Structure 1
Amino acid sequence: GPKFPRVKNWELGSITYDTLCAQSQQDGPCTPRRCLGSLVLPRPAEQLLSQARDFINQYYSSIKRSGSQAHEERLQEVEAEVASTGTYHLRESELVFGAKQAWRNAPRCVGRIQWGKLQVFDARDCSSAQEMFTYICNHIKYATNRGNLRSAITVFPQRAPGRGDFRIWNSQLVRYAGYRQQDGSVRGDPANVEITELCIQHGWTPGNGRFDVLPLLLQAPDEAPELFVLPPELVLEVPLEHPTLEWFAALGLRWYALPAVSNMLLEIGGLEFSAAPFSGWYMSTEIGTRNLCDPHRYNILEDVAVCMDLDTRTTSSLWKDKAAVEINLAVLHSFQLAKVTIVDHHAATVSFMKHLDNEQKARGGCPADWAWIVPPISGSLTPVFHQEMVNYILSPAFRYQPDPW
């Protein structure tokens, strides 16, 4: 056989070899001695030029003008630009290409079948926090599109030598408040206690509900962040009801439509875009299993099981399994009823296999994080469970970055 990692599908018996991974410049957490793939937190002078060069080569290949005059001049242009300023800038269409390619490269995203259809908003002219808010609102309105959801990213100015970053402080554009109680419990989402307390320390008047939408804390270079409240009619939400358990609607559960990640760094050709929120549409277990059922999130499993009258006294009743199923169904059903785009874990992983097969033909491999791609309920029921995956970092990339506080 060839000298590349052999990849196997155990449902179908079919083999592939990943040859893409040879183009991995940046290393991962693993050595020949121990496997750190399950761990969730994955722990320039001439160094910029070589990343830039390599990026410009990717751009040129993808437009098939590799080795052209236009290619060799762009490289010279980037040399010279780095030469006199320490940095360089991307052509509009270089940024569009880099953004889709960052998405294409993201090992943990299961929606990558869609990678080619990404609206890139170019917001590198933005010069204030107020202006970031407008751009974000535009993003929300465009991506939400009354429930007919549309992938999009907005790119604010790149990190710049010595001058401070644009940062959105919130981890998503839509997030519910988490209020620490005297009894030590939390009202709302325990995931958001810190950013809740920061919004208050920064003058937000806090509600006290279970599903208060957070204000955005936005930060322009070298300035304190500023608070912006989203006008409620921009933030589309779905009340959760269950197609047959009539009492589930009485639980007053809801979820927002737009999943928009706002604290990741987009790295292109060595340039770093510290503020570059992106959004897709939800895969249903992100809501019905993680957000509503994690013990450290809303944790509603016992409540739903009690209403369903299950024996919550014994693990072997499978009461957790039954409640989780019904919560996922409710989420699916309610987004359907509301006409808000959503995808179940079956449809999603099926499309993601199609994705793998496309990338196998197009680039000879596809970096994929098995733990993240396999859904949190019904694992071996989906085809990705039976698919081996190779995980590696390719650039352009979306990367985590330290919280700005």
Structure 2
Amino acid sequence: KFPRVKNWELGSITYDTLCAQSQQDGPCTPRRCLGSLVLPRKLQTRPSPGPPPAEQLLSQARDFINQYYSSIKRSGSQAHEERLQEVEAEVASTGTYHLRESELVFGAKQAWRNAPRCVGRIQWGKLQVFDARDCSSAQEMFTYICNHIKYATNRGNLRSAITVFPQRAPGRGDFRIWNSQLVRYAGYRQQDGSVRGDPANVEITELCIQHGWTPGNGRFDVLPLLLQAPDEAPELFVLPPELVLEVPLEHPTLEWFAALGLRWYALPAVSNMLLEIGGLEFSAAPFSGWYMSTEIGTRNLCDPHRYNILEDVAVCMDLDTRTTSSLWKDKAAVEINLAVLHSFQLAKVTIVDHHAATVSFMKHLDNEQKARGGCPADWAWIVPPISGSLTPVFHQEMVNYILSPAFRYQPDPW
């Protein structure tokens, strides 16, 4: 049952004993493997048609409480048993319970640490947790969000942070940030079916306009936020421009690159994922750290279904776009990623290239093998979108599983 994991570059071997702590199932079965699939239906965090079985919740709760007390080394102590009784007393009476701030802080860090698709987990211990559970309106959500952005951005010296809004309650709507990220560019479906801006945001762009936003017409227009308090229609809030740090893209040696007018925001703040700690679900808990250059240079700017600039750059580079064998695509992509690194560095905005990132992830895997006996990792997401085998992670076998606390996907609120 315990997987023999091998590193093909070093020839070393380790055994993942941590996967035995996985209580939640993945999409894979012995008959077939579905690991390369992005979204699920089995792993998806379904709404509250009523309260989930007190036994199920009490079981996830006690385990989390056990995890917390081990973390502070006060396991078995009086404080530990009294807390377990508190949780049980609360679930038995109300069908749910609440976390203390220190437990929420520990839970958020473990969720990040347990994230299989995150290559920046060496930073898991350093996380600023903003308790926003004292929130009752969309307007209050906006203030907490603005403060998250101000803190996280820090004039370019990015700091990892997460803001946790009120947990889900049975028989009541969720607190939700409709946007997939706190900062995203609009995608305007221009008549011909084409798109001006980010194609990945066409839907959220349409909703913002549908809710009163007067749209622009640029390729890089920062979107307003649609914040939703329980059982209320989402409200529109335009983020203050001084809060949104952006980096104009230019190349270190190619003068004309800047002419392309490309740019990207500094803060990657995913805001559509659910944070589950001890059975409790936080439907609104935006998190952020800092970008790895390939996210912008390769995926956001070069994906065919995104900005898709590979050809424009190749033409400017005077490459042979007539045939695939000239590797015009590979060359253009390398310069674009280089332009991203040069630009962010020039602007004094935190960023990490894929080589540095994967090297530190390998160190993280080692730290974790000693600390927990394994590390859940999704190979397809950990290995960068360009130069895969040129990085150490490509040659490392990985085991993917779900541990809790965890960040999970959830249905779109509309």
Scaled to the shorter chain, the TM-score interval is over 0.9
Aligned-pair distance for 1:70?
1.1
Q: Cα distance, 1:60 vs. partner?
A: 0.8
Q: How far apart are residue 46 of structure 1 and its match?
A: 1.1
**TM-score (norm. length: structure 2):** 0.97
Cα displacement string for residues 322-357 of structure 1 (whole angstroms, at most 9, x for unaligned residues): 000000000000000000000000000000000000
**Matches of 1:260 and 1:175 in 2, distance apart?**
9
SS in structure 2 of the partner of residue 121 of structure 1: strand
Q: What do residues 210-263 of structure 1 show as CA deviations (whole Å, max 9, x unaligned)?
A: 000000000011111000000111000000000000000000000000000001
Secondary structure of the corresponding residue to residue 214 of structure 1: coil
The 3-state SS of whatever aligns with 1:247 is helix
Deviations 1:88-141 (A, max 9, x none): 000110000000000000000000000000000001001110000000000000
Measured in 1, the distance between the counterparts of 2:412 and 2:184 equals: 16
User: Which of 23, 27, 30 is the aligned partner of 1:29?
Assistant: 27
Distance 1:139 1:182 in 2: 37
Given candidates 11, 14, 37, the residue that maps to 2:12 is 14
Q: Secondary structure at the match of 2:227?
A: strand
Q: 1:263-296: per-residue Cα shift (whole Å, max 9, x none)?
A: 1000000000000000010000000000000000
Equivalent pairs counted in the alignment come to: 402
Are 1:266 and 2:275 an aligned pair? yes
Picking from 196, 200, 204, the partner of 1:187 is 196
Give SS of 2:233's match.
Answer: coil
1:134-184 Cα deviation digits (max 9, x unpaired): 000000000000000000000001001212110000000000000001111
Q: Counterparts of 1:401 and 1:161 in 2: how far apart (Å)?
A: 16
Give, in whole Å, the separation in 2 of the partners of 1:223 and 1:327.
43
Tell me what 1:214 maps to: 223
- Pairwise CA distance, 1:315: 0.3
CA contact (8 A) 2:376 2:398 kept: yes
Pairing 1:56–2:54 present: no
State the percentage of identical aligned residues.
100
Task: Write the distance in 2 (CA, Å) between the matches of 1:322 and 1:98.
Answer: 43
Deviations 1:356-400 (A, max 9, x none): 000000000000000000000000000000000000000000000
Q: Is the 8 A contact 2:246 2:263 kept in 1?
A: yes
So what's the TM-score if we normalise by structure 1? 0.99
Q: Secondary structure at the match of 2:281?
A: strand
Q: Distance in 2 between matches of 1:317 and 1:41?
A: 35
Q: 1:127 and 2:127 equivalent?
A: no
- Secondary structure of the 1:165 match is coil
Following superposition of structure 1 onto structure 2, how do residues 34-45 of structure 1 map, counting pairs within 5 Å? 34-42=32-40, 44-45=53-54
Q: How far 1:4 sits from its partner (Å)?
A: 1.1
Give the C-alpha shift of residue 305 in structure 1. 0.1
Give RMSD over aligned pairs: 0.6
Structure 1 window deviating more from structure 2 (158-167 vs 300-309): it is 158-167
Q: Distance in 2 between matches of 1:146 and 1:125?
A: 27
Q: 1:106 aligns with which of 108, 115, 124?
A: 115
Q: Distance in 2 between matches of 1:233 and 1:69?
A: 49
Give the secondary-structure state (helix, strand or coil) at the position aligned to 1:187.
strand
Q: How does 1:62-141 map to 2 (within 5 A)?
A: 62-141=71-150
Q: Do the aligned residues in 1 keep the contact of 2:197 with 2:219 (CA within 8 Å)?
A: yes
Aligned-partner Cα distance in 2 for 1:294–1:133:
31
Partner Cα distance (1:33, 1:266) in 2: 31
2:214 paired residue number: 205
Q: How far off its partner does 1:65 sit?
A: 1.3
Flag as ranges the 4+ runs of structure 1 deviating above 6 A: none
Question: Counterpart of 2:169?
Answer: 160
Equivalent residue of 1:231, what SS? coil
Where 1:160 maps in the other structure, the secondary structure is: coil
- Looking at structure 1, the residues matched to 194 and 134 of structure 2 have their Cα atoms a distance apart, in angstroms, of 44
Measure, in 1, the Cα distance between the counterparts of 2:30 and 2:412.
32
CA distance in 1, matches of 2:128, 2:82: 28
Query: Aligned partners of 1:358 and 1:313: how far apart in 2?
Result: 48
CA distance in 2, matches of 1:89, 1:60: 16
Deviation (angstroms), 1:68: 1.4
Q: Is the 8 A contact 2:272 2:410 kept in 1?
A: yes
Query: How far apart, CA to CA, are the structure 1 residues paired with 2:29 and 2:229?
Result: 40
SS at match of 1:282: coil
Deviation (angstroms), 1:200: 0.4
SS at match of 1:266: strand
Q: Distance in 2 between matches of 1:318 and 1:159?
A: 50
Q: Which runs of 5+ in 2 are unaligned?
A: 41-52
Q: Is the 8 A contact 2:54 2:92 kept in 1?
A: no
What is the distance in 2 between the residues matched to 1:189 and 1:317?
A: 28
Residue 158 of structure 2 contacts residue 349 of structure 2 at CA under 8 Å; is this kept in 1? yes
User: 1:21-66, CA deviations, whole angstroms, 9 ceiling, x for partnerless residues?
Assistant: 0000001111111111111113x32110000011100001111111
Q: Tell me, yes or no, if the aligned pair for 2:314 and 2:328 is still in contact at 8 Å.
A: yes
Q: Note the C-alpha offset of 1:74.
A: 0.6
CA distance in 1, matches of 2:261, 2:28: 45
Partner Cα distance (1:227, 1:4) in 2: 50
Give the Å deviation of 1:77: 0.6
CA distance in 2, matches of 1:73, 1:258: 41
